[PDB]
Amino acid sequence: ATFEIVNRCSYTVWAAASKGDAALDAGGRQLNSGESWTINVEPGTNGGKIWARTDCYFDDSGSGICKTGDCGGLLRCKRFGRPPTTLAEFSLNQYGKDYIDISNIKGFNVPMDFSPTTRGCRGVRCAADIVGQCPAKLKAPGGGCNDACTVFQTSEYCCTTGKCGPTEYSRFFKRLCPDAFSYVLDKPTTVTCPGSSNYRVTFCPT
């Protein structure tokens, strides 16, 4: 599958793509404002995620730090990133279907649109000013708006027992971005697309 990752933000982001135990494609790259990066993701990939990282410094070896979404200090991510991170999530070629969503379960850093570029399903977007509106207790100093599980580490926010409800914090994310997951047991906003669709992820779509 082809994903085109586009940075429409006015600032540089460092895109990342991983399935948790491995990079997808090169795993990460710098995207200046307006740049597009096309990656190829193996069919059958389950549990892939794409995100943006902000305020990164890397040396010549590709080692460094980012203020949001750092993946163990590497330019080319092999593992998932540190919250807060708006997530584009996908599982491809799962019994004939691809499944895509946007998640705020690990917080929000950059607004995102995640849309197919082929026929037969709709995209999803979370483009509200979640950072500007973020509750005081969830604001991350480095930038972004943390989820409550990251901040407070309770069974209720992290849904550790597999039973949890919505919370004042989850409802914040859900009010601003209804089409994104706000907590682990949220009513799913997954979209089902034809198997082997292609996609575009746009940072700062509006």
Rounded distance, CA 121 to CA 67, Å? 34
Question: Which residues on adjacent β-strands are paired with residue 115?
Answer: 200
| Residue where the block lists tokens 């509750």 | 135
- Gap between the Cα atoms of 23 and 41, Å rounded: 10
Resolution (A): 1.5
Whether cis (ω within 30° of 0) applies to the bond prior to 205 is no
- What's 101's DSSP letter? E
Judged on CB neighbours under 10 Å (0-12, 13-18, 19+), 187 is: exposed
DSSP for residue 34: T
* 9, 50, 116, 175 from 90: Cα distances, Å: 23, 9, 12, 23
Element (H, E) at 59: none
DSSP 198: -
If you write DSSP's letter for every residue of 115-156 in order, what string do you get? EESSSS---EEE-S-HHHH--GGGB-TTSSB--HHHHH--HH
- Any idea where the domains of the chain sit in the sequence? 1-206
Experimental determination technique: X-ray
The contacts of residue 121 (CB under 8 Å, 6+ apart) are 100, 191, 192, 193, 194, 197
Instruction: Measure the CA–CA gap between 18 and 27, rounded to whole angstroms.
Output: 6
- Beta-strand runs (E) in the chain: 2-7, 13-18, 23-31, 36-40, 48-58, 64-68, 87-94, 97-103, 112-116, 124-126, 180-181, 191-194, 199-203
CB atoms within 10 A of CB 43: 11
Q: What is the DSSP letter of 160?
A: T
Which of helix, strand or coil describes residue 170?
Answer: helix
> Contact at 8 Å (CB) between 9 and 48?
no
Pairing of strands 2-7, 191-194: unpaired
CATH assignment, 1-206: 2.60.110.10
Residues followed by a break in the chain, C–N over 2.5 Å?
A: none
Neighbours of 22 (CB within 10 A): 13
**What is the per-residue burial (b if ≥16 Cβ within 10 Å, else e) of 151-184?**
beeeebbbbeeeebeebebbebbbebbebbbbbb
Collapsing DSSP to helix, strand or coil, 69 comes out as coil
